[PDB]
Each structure stands twice: as structure tokens, then as C-alpha cells.
């Protein structure tokens with residue numbers, strides 16, 4: 409815009425282009441996201457306007473929402489790096505466990521807050537987790553499907569990452585619950601630990617089958633109602649659950665226990681962010697300083 413001075417393009421966003429910009433007046437540096445149209449949902453803008461109130465230390469602040477012309481501008485507090493880049497940079501050595509624990513703990517605090525205010529993220533992934541030099545990590549770019557939604561891609565040809573999608577979403581459930589976020593965070597937790605994506609599916613069915621191959625094909629015993637789900641097929645292959653210690657070695661039993669609860673198939677059995685915070689895994693949590701190279 410004109411009130412802002414573009415610094416550089418931070419890339420593509422789940423909905424549009426993103427720029428690092430400076431407010432010519434306040435001099436503050438922000439992330440400016442330009443969103444896609446037939447008049448722009450007057451309901452969406454209200455939804456968005458609601459999130460501006462959602463303030464928490466582990467949630468990227470939505471500073472402003474500006475609807476002008478056929479474009480929508482979202483102004484966010486700026487953070488220099490995302491967890492995906494950080495994980496790639498830590499690939500050879502791995503993120504120290506104390507930092508993994510600190511990040512997981514902060515993300516659960518953020519989720520507990522959002523969920524207590526009936527806000528779902530719905531599209532958690534490493535790239536949507538931002539970090540700073542102070543050791544903080546924050547939840548960004550909430551993709552409320554009931555706030556704007558999502559077409560075939562982001563809005564302009566872009567392979568949607570399904571790696572962190574909960575099974576109920578893949579099985580066609582129409583109503584997402586706070587559980588979908590816990591699932592995604594469990595997938596991220598596993599990835600920070602092993603330094604490899606837990607379920608790197610390349611299609612919706614491959615995503616689902618990779619989950620089944622690891623956690624076992626779900627049945628009525630572990631997930632009541634699963635065989636009645638919209639996209640469930642009795643023809644799904646039946647895979648045996650793999651031993652859990654093979655999945656995120658060499659994570660300790662406290663960690664494996666928490667992860668297993670974050671990855672329960674039944675959304676109703678899946679642990680809540682609030683309850684996960686009380687898990688013994690966090691008895692010795694601290695807040696380390698990451699080695700960030702900006």
C-alpha cells in the first residue's frame with residue numbers, strides 16, 4: 409500500500425502474497441498479507457475482525473484487517489523465521505530436546521487459549537509457527553474454514569500440504585473440533601524429534617494410508633463411528649498398528665506417552681491442549697534460547 413513501505417516479499421501465503429513492510433508513520437515492521445473474488449464475504453471480514461481481539465503471547469498478533477477494492481489486507485506482528493526453516497537448519501544436529509519441549513509447551517499454551525475462546529486453527533504446520541530470538545514460538549495464519557475456507561489450492565496453483573491433517577478431516581468429517589489441532593501439533597512434535605515428517609502423504613489417500621500403516625487401520629473398537637464416516641471405505645486395507653517405539657526414536661517414554669495421546673484416532677479420546685500441558689513430559693520444561701541466524 410501507500411501507508412506502508414514494502415521491504416521485501418516474504419513469499420506466498422495460504423491465501424495470497426506476503427510482504428515484510430514498514431509503517432511509514434509508526435515505523436513498525438510488519439508482515440502484510442494481501443488476499444484474493446465476487447465482492448469479498450462481508451461475514452468473513454467480521455470473522456477476521458474478531459481475531460484481532462485474540463491476543464496471547466504465543467499467537468501472532470493480527471494488527472489490522474483492511475478491506476479495500478477487491479483485495480483484503482491482513483497486518484500481522486512480524487517474526488523473522490518459521491519453524492520449517494528452523495528445522496531444516498537444525499537437520500544435521502537436531503533441535504535440542506529442551507527446546508523441542510519448550511516449543512511444544514508454548515504451542516499447547518497457545519492452543520489452549522484459542523480453544524478456550526472457541527477458535528480453531530485448522531491448518532497447523534511448521535511453516536505457520538513463527539519463532540524469535542527470545543525463544544518464543546507463536547501460532548500464525550489461522551485458516552478457519554468457516555471464516556473464508558479453501559479451494560483446490562491456496563487460491564492460485566499451490567500444492568496443499570496434507571502432512572498434518574487429522575484423520576477425521578481426511579475421512580470427510582464436516583465438523584472439525586479442537587482435536588484437529590492437537591493431531592497436527594503431535595505430527596509437528598514427532599517431526600522435531602525425528603527430523604523427518606511423520607506422515608508425508610502426497611495425496612489424500614496416501615496421507616490416510618500412511619497414517620493407517622503406522623497407527624493401524626482404525627476400527628470401531630478404537631474409533632467408534634469411524635466406519636460410518638463420509639469417506640470411509642470397507643475396502644481400506646487393514647494394517648496392524650506398529651510398535652510405538654519405532655515411530656519417534658529415541659524419544660523417551662514421557663514423550664512417547666504424550667505423543668500417543670495427541671495421536672489417538674478418536675477425536676474424543678485425543679488429549680486436549682489443557683490436559684497435555686499437565687503431562688509429566690513437561691515436568692522439567694524450561695525456555696532455552698535458540699541459535700537463530702537471521
Ligand SMILES: NC(=O)c1cc([N+](=O)[O-])c(Cl)cc1NCc1cnc(Cl)nc1
Pocket residue numbers: 418419420421422426428438439440441468484485486487488489490538548549
Ligand atoms: N507474521 C509474520 O511475520 C509472517 C507472516 C507471513 N504470512 O503472512 O504468511 C509469513 Cl509467510 C511469514 C512471516 N514471518 C516469518 C518470516 C519468514 N521469512 C522471512 Cl524472510 N521473514 C519472515
